[PDB]
Every structure is written in structure tokens, then in C-alpha cells.
RNA sequence: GCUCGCCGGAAGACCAAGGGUUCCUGUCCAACGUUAAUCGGGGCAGGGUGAGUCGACCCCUAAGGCGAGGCCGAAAGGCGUAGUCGAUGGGAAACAGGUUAAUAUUCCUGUACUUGGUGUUACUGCGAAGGGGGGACGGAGAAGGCUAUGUUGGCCGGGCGACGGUUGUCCCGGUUUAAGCGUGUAGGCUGGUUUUCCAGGCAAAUCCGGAAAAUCAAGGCUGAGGCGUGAUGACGAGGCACUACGGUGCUGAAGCAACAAAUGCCCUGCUUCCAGGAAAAGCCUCUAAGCAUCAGGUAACAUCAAAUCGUACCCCAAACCGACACAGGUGGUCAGGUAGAGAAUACCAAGGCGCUUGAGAGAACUCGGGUGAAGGAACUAGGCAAAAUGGUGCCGUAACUUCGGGAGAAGGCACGCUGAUAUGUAGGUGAGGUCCCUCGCGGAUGGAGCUGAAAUCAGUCGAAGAUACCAGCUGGCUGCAACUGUUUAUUAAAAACACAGCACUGUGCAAACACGAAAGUGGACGUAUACGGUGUGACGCCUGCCCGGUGCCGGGAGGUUAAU
RNA sequence: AGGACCGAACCGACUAAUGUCGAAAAAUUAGCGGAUGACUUGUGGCUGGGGGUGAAAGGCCAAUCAAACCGGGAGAUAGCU
């Protein structure tokens, strides 16, 4: 019963991290759609 | 060389080894080695372009001297070796000056022979020189297609190309496929067949031997579903189609060649 | 050379505790509280300048912040850096 | 606290990942805890994570990512050169003891070691993005040497036993010591040294590669381990003091041999096999531009520095992934005794637990088991499930066979303990002393001691000696698939898929083909003994007729026919 | 030597019972197959939606797959309830 979420902070940050978002045009627009909604935690960094 | 293996195990029952006992047992010559990472068939875009590739043993790359661009300098063979990147073997040769280079191993090239390239080469096998100094009718291998290009024809195990004619600046060559083809008289070529002519006689016995040469299984489009292959579907071994590749194009006889740039050199196409 | 304007900023407070008094008695170490930045060189010079003692070696460690809730809202105390400053022989005050 | 019981290749111990204070102390019992709770991984407060050497960081790179310029693309952007990042790999150095309520290779005691700086002194050619070396590499097998460790004996301390006996071949406990430093072993590999030259190592090289000549035959490298020092130190069963009755205080004897021994280490070795088994820095060396008296390099001293981050705790789980204090999942490391081939299994050690509702009762019925008269598949869709067989040695073993198999076919017999052969043998180990020498960690000896199976004979006990756990049911005919394998995560594991093998077919390399508006990439750093597609599916014997339809290959007499 | 044999770790999942508001949104118990290899596993990476990958089952692509999930077109449309 290997559940789907097997955590790893390295994989987490390289996939959904801030720098991961900011690398690409489409990700720089996820941070825009989150600053829009006014999210406290923009990305996964903690 | 060609030895049938005793059936002490199913999967050993049909193996036919090719045990050439003069290959240098041990490690290759380091300065002529380099990384060679398996691709998996995958390409630039990371998608499989060539199917049924991936796996098998890790194998280094042996920088083979194909140009053979050392003239006047005689070279002595010193080691016949096993190259996993070819079907032929290779032959570490040592020049008078002190350079070592792997070359394809011809049929009679044994450790101790002497060879040299350039127009002043003798026509004993293992020598390379332009197919303007080589006599018509001779058997040659490691043929170039453009002068200095490097050597692209007759490189497999036991494959050779014979200079059939010579119409001034060009040279007709009966390629191992049966097709004749003009090749500029300056295109260098090395004499005699290539070694390891028994290569074709191994039988591999089992599926794992296909595997560890980097060959993944090949599904028959008949077994697939209508979505995967043009063949496919049908409530139990139904075909009704003309045999086509997985991409619709017809196979079982359909000329896919279209070059129009090099067909001026193809004197007589293969048979 | 460390500027005294920084040396007067480094040290925060003496850390008083059972283990701190224990280290003082049986090992002549003054447990301290220093700023988070606080290189060991920073701390050693600050001690030798502001207490005028002779330090043999410093051994820092960063203490994390307890997640201390206050009522319903969740809280988080701050990280701080401890400094086990071992004096040679001289004295503490 | 005593007794009982459970795990003990784990249900113990240490980690990584992940978590994030759950760690320790005091304190409280509302809520949380499937019950009560004084207790807690709960609430509140305080404390606790100490590094030149252990990880990270850092240096170097793999796959891969990004990518100045560049090429391509309606725009976004795609690809990619230099370059730059990217461990899961490569790169310097610390161990033992003690100590905390909670940290320890971090603190303290002792004993080290590494890399840089900076002077000093003395010798001095130094100088890199560049050359060369090394780093640096597989699978399997076979041993031999040793160690971890264990067992026994000795030695030391203690006891002489609640019930027959227990001054003895008696019982109990201990019998530990590291890094480092110095030897340089069992071993493994290499032939050394010198002079001369050389179209090769993108220049240069005094280095590597090469050709010789001389000259010697040994030199060199690697290396477990052991041995000495480290260490007359620590540790040490216990004893004597006092009590928070929880440990601090002091002292502390012996501290050895033999045998067995690893899956650990020599071994990145050796032997072999084909499938032919990273890179790059660190390190060594060579010169270039440059200085060349300098600078810089070397060695001895002296001192300096070694930053920052992590360090508590769980980690096969109540702390991580599963909504839960969830019978699930989770990579690595260490692995004691007896019996055992064994990391199985049984019982135990160190250690840790009794799984967070109990108390009774002793209905039906359900679940997990034990036993069963006579019969023995009559059950049933079906011997489903149970039952049964189950080990080692020797004898023996059918059709068929592709000569390997089938086969552990089938079947039969023996098995405990005691004694003798032989107060323990064959074997293994191997002491002293005796020599011999290039004297060593040497060699021949030489057999004390230890260890020690197996067998034969005789006796003896039981219903039963493979006595428990553990541990094949067997045989006949037949369909299909050659076989091993893969398969529908979560109702289908098959005859399906794959396969080796066979054939047809395309493809001459700017290969076909595929991904791509393109560039480009794979194919392949391959070259027709290669590569793709399709079908069939080992092997043996073979694979017959039909070219009308459809497709493909070619042909050109004519008909028809687009843009123009 | 072996895609050899028996058999633990390890991987898998053939049968049966249980469980079926479960201890568990696929497990437990007892047996079962492979167990030096077409093996298994840790870390990191690459491939993406008419697309990927597929020893091929329409299998898998985050408990979702004959076309994922999220947001939008969007208050789709619904002679139907």
C-alpha cells in the first residue's frame, strides 16, 4: 500500500518551488494568479 | 569459434557461441575510450523515436580510426580486441612515431601484421589508399563516400565492397547489398573484407541475450487494440488489413526511398 | 579587525540555566545568548573586549523557536544562537 | 518490587528520507487518549541540540536542467555552442574513557592526525584553461590468510546452597582496552637502471608513447592481519561510606592461552566469462605565455587559522506515507547462545515489551484450532478445504528423450543413548625444544595441548529415535503454450503478451523511419553480418493450388485528365 | 556454466477462509511462484493529454483514464426528470 504522496523536499522544491515557477512564463503567471487571490503562502518553501 | 552449447538448461539448449580466442582478454586501450550513454530510443524531445531500444550492458565507446589519415607511416598491429559498438572487432595498431589507434579488423589481420595508408601503400590487405590507386576488381572495405568523409561502406562483420569499374573520375562499387553505386575515385578505401565473418552465426538461445544487447520486446500490431496500431482488434486473431507500419504507411513491399540528390550515383539498385 | 561598534552589538544576554551553571562550575564555560549572525570569532572577540577576559574557544549552537500558541492564534518564538564560551582560567562576573 | 508471559535476522540498537520540539524537568486533567487516569507523543512553564576531523556547505563531475552568442519559429517560444548548475558517485584529517535530567567521534581526560596562511632559515627554475599519468570502475567463481566474534581451559573474586548429594572434573561472575605511531607479514602486481635519438600526444616538454644500445638481474608498488608502543593509563566483578533510597565517594583483583570462526577484511586481488563493464576534479608530473637575480617551488622550525549550517527526538513507527495513537507501506547498517546446512526454525541473551476498556459467565450461532468409532470422495460444479507425504545416507528407479533430462521417478532399508575399537579415531590446528640460514613477522622438524566428525561392533530405554518446530504427496492418459519470463495496481495470470528462431519487406547513409510549423534529435557516434516495419513463434518433417478482387512492384500501345 | 534445481531475505499474488458500516477505499491467516536474473531495490532525472509509456490489459499516467486534473467558454445543451 504505497500511497501516492511519498514526500521528498528536494523533489518538492524542484517541481513546485518558487524558482521552479519563476523559471517559465507559465509559472510566473501562477504566482500572479496567487498574489491576485492574496495567498499567504505563494509556493512550497516551508 | 562457432560452438553449439550443450542443453544443460533450456535457454542454453540453442545457444551458439562465437568464441574468437585471439581477442585481447582484459581491458581496452584507455586513451581511445570515452563515455557512451544509452539513449533508450528517446531523443531531443524525450519521446521514443526508435522503438524497442533500451537496456542491456553498459558499453564504452572505442574511437576507431576511420579516416586513416596517416600517410607514409607504417603501422604494426599489436592487439585484436572486442568492440561492443560494432559487429566487427578492432585492432589496436602502433605507428612508427608512437601513436596508437583502433582500426576495423580485416579478415586476415593478425597481431603482428604491418600496415600503412596513403597512395604509396602496398595492396596487401589492411592497407588503405584512394580507390584510384587501388586496382579495379579488388575487394575493399571501410569505403568512404566523400574524399576525407571517413569511411562508411563495408564496416560490418565480414562485409566487403569490390571495385567493379572505374569511369574516369568515378568508381562503380558492388555494395554488399548488391546495388552498384558510383563513388569518387578519391574516396579512400581499405583492402580486404572485415573480420568476424562468423558473427552472423551466433544464435543467442534465449530472450535474455536479446535483452542484454539492448533490445526490448516487439509487440505484434495484431495483438494491440485499434487505437494503438492500424492492425488490432477483432474477436480473436482477425487481420483483414494490408500490413502497414504503426504509422499507417504500408510495408511488405513499398519503395520508401526518395532522395533525387544521390540517385545519380546509384548505377544499379539492389535486387 | 572587528569594529567595536559591532562587538558592542554581538552579545545579547547571559543564558542562566541548570546546565549553564553546571558548565560554569565544572568546565569554566559561560553560556551566553548572542545575535543570530555572530561568528565564533565575533563572539570570542566581543567577550575578550567587553569582559576583558581570555577566551580559549567558543562553541555555538542555534536554538530553534518553540511553536508557542497563545490562545487560539498560533505562535512561533524566534531562533536564537547560544554560545558556550570557555574561559581559560581567569574569572566570571 | 517480586512472579508470570511475549519478541529476540526483532517487537532490540544506530541512521538516511520524512516529521518538526513529539526530547528532559516541573506542573494541571477541561478537551485529546475508543474506558478511569494521579499517566501521555495532551495543556502550561522552563530547560535541552556545543564539531578543524561526523554530515552538509565547498571542489569535481553522471543522467539531466538552464543556456551569452547562434540556428529555427506568427508571438509566446524550440534547439543548442561556450559556459553553467546538477549526487544517488569521486575529493584532507579522531579515537578510547568519563560525563547530562536531557548533547556527545561535538563537552572534559588522554593520545593523534589533516589542509592552508604567515614569517624564519637553507637549498633552489618556477609558471596553466594546455600535454601525460592516476583517480578509473563488469559478472561469476574459487579458495587461502586474518579479524569481528564465540567456546573451552587457565587466572582472579565470590559460594558451599530453603529438599537427597555438592571441597570438587563443583557452582557463579569477570577475564576489556581504540585511533594513532613503528615494523612490514600472509600475500597480489611489476623486471629493474642508464645513455642515445623520434613524422605521435592541436604548441612545447626534461613527461607520456616509440626505436634502439648498454647494464643488471633484482628493484619497486599494494597489502589484511599479527607484533610493540599508545597503556605501570583508562576499564574492571566487587568491597568498604552515606543517603536524594535515586547515585554519587573511594578503592578495585585477574585481565591469558587454545580452538572454532564469518556473508566482514586482504580483494578495486586471483581465475575466468561475454553481454565487454561512468566522467571530472583532488593527487603526481611536463612544459607554454611570464618572470627568470626576483617572483615561485622544496624541506625544518615557529605560530596562526579551519568559517557557516545540521546535531534534541521518532525512523519498519503512536512522532514518516495512509483522514485515526490505523493489523498496511518505508531504504540502509549491527547482527550473541544452544540445536540447526541455514539470515529458516525452536528455545533464550543484550535489550524491549504484555499490543489503552476491564470483570464475570461458560447458551445458540460465527471465527481460529485439537481429536474422532466404522466407512473412506459415497461430498461436490470440482478431492474446494482439510488430511497425508516431508530429513540425511546407502541401495534402487519406468515409458519416453532434444542425451542434458525425466529423477528426489517409483520403491526399500538405517537412524536414539551408552560403551569399545579409540579414557576421542580419521581430519584440522599446532606448543616446546632440536636444528639451518640471506636472523626475520624465516624455513625443515617435532609432536605436547586443543578441536574433532563419520563408521563398525556390543549393550540399553521407549508404542514411537528424521521423535518438537522445520520439512516433496505420488503415479497414468490427454488438450494448449516450446521453455524462463510479462500481463488487466483493485473480481481474469491464462491457451493471452514476449521470446529465441524463421521469412517477407524497406533502407547506400543527409539511410529509411520517428519526434518536431522549422532548426535539430533519435536511429547511431551505427554503415546492409547494419537498421526499421510486418507476420510466425524453440526443435523435427514440411509449408500445396489460385495473381481474378484489394494492395504493392514495374510497363508503356492507346483512352481520359488539373492548374496553365 | 546455467534467463539450472531446492529454499529464507527480497519481489510477486495461484487457492481458501475471514473481513465486506473492515484492523485496511484491496488487507490478514494458512498454504502458493520466482529467488544470479528478461532479477530486485534506493536516490536523482526525462517523456503529458488525442499526448506519454505500454513483454499489450485499453493497461498505467497521484485512491480518477475508450482520452487526467484544474480554471475558463459556461448559467453549454437537455423536445427529458
Residue numbers in the entry:
A (entry chain 2): 1 to 46
B (entry chain C): 1 to 271
C (entry chain T): 1 to 93
Q: What text does the study give?
A:
A smaller fraction of PRE complexes without EF-G is in a rotated state with tRNAs in hybrid (H) states, denoted H1 or H2 depending on the orientation of the A-site tRNA elbow region relative to the LSU. The ratio of H1 to H2 on rotated ribosomes is independent of EF-G, indicating that factor binding or GTP hydrolysis do not affect the tRNA dynamics on the LSU. However, these thermal motions alone, in the absence of EF-G, are not sufficient to promote the displacement of tRNAs together with the mRNA on the SSU. tRNA movement on the SSU is the rate-limiting step of translocation in the absence of EF-G11 and is slow in the absence of GTP hydrolysis.
